[PDB]
C-alpha cells in the first residue's frame, strides 16, 4: 500500500482511490482496475 503502491485504475482514474497492493491490473467494479 504505502511502500508498494496499490492502484493502477482503469475508465477515468487517477486520484488515490485506493484499495491495497494488486501489484497486477485486474478488476474490483468495472472503472477500477485493481486489488485481487
Not at 503502491?5 to 477500477?32: D, E, H, K
Amino acid at each position: 500500500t504505502q511502500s508498494h503502491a496499490g492502484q493502477c485504475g482503469g475508465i477515468g482514474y487517477s486520484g488515490p482511490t485506493v484499495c491495497a497492493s494488486g501489484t497486477t491490473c485486474q478488476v474490483l467494479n468495472p472503472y477500477y482496475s485493481q486489488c485481487l
